[PDB]
């Protein structure tokens, strides 16, 4: 049901909901792996369901509707530790392609589309272990969609081939992220 930021377990799925406090966001956990997000002139937020910990060969399925009006992403999102890495496999996005100005590190074909791979660096930013400097790895789908299946191993193996290694897996979720925008989404994970 409607909850305030936090992390926990719901119907067998790990969930994480965070927001910068600006307001304008409603996150609701549904049955099974379902979750809904409704936002209007929000601030920055991230919300989704998945696993804690994730794995490097997980096949993630998602089904739903995603209607952003502004800056937002729909992705398989997570972290690794040692090395500390924040990663995204972007399936759809709004007005801003998150790879803008990022360094392209290759291409990978998976689950019906070509994905462009990028690497970016975050300096002194919040992370799962505190403020730190770390890399972000991205796989951005060329053919946008709101349902599908993601074979994570295809992305992690392609990243490894390019020198983008991952450490020990931390949480792994299908999440909706927004940055001062409006929208609605209803996703079921499995």
Swiss-Prot record:
Residues with the Pyrrolidone carboxylic acid modification = 1
What is one process in the GO biological process aspect for this record?
xylan catabolic process
Q: Where in the cell is it found?
A: Secreted
Record-listed substrate binding positions: 73, 77, 88, 122, 126, 136, 171
Provide a GO CC annotation, any one.
extracellular region
Question: Per its UniProt record, what SUPFAM superfamilies does this chain match?
Answer: Concanavalin A-like lectins/glucanases
Question: Which residues act catalytically here?
Answer: 86, 177
GH11 domain: residues covered: 1-189
Where is it chiefly localized? Answer: secreted
**InterPro entries in the record, alphabetically?**
ConA-like_dom_sf, GH11/12, GH11_AS_1, GH11_AS_2, GH11_dom, Glyco_hydro_11
UniProt-recorded Gene Ontology molecular function terms: endo-1,4-beta-xylanase activity
Cite the Pfam families for this sequence: Glyco_hydro_11 (PF00457)
Q: What is its EC number?
A: 3.2.1.8
Record-stated family: Belongs to the glycosyl hydrolase 11 (cellulase G) family.
From the Swiss-Prot or TrEMBL record, give the protein name. Answer: Endo-1,4-beta-xylanase 2
Which species expresses this protein natively? Hypocrea jecorina (strain ATCC 56765 / BCRC 32924 / NRRL 11460 / Rut C-30)
């Amino acid at each position: 049901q409607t909850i305030q930021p936090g992390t926990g377990y719901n119907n067998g799925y790990f969930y994480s909901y965070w927001n910068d406090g600006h307001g304008g966001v409603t996150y609701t956990n549904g049955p099974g792996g379902q979750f809904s997000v409704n936002w209007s002139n929000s601030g920055n937020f991230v919300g989704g369901k998945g696993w804690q910990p994730g794995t490097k060969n997980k096949v993630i399925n998602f089904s739903g509707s995603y209607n952003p009006n502004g800056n937002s992403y729909l992705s398989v999102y997570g972290w690794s530790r040692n090395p500390l890495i924040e990663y995204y496999i972007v399936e759809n996005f709004g007005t801003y392609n998150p790879s803008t100005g990022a360094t392209k590190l290759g291409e990978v074909t998976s689950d019906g589309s070509v994905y462009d791979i990028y690497r970016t660096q975050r300096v002194n930013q919040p992370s799962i272990i505190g403020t730190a400097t770390f890399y972000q790895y991205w796989s951005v789908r060329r053919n946008h969609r709101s349902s599908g299946s993601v074979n994570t191993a295809n992305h992690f193996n392609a990243w490894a081939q390019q020198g983008l290694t991952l450490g020990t897996m931390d949480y792994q979720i299908v999440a909706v992220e927004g940055y001062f925008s409006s929208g609605s989404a209803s996703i079921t994970v499995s």
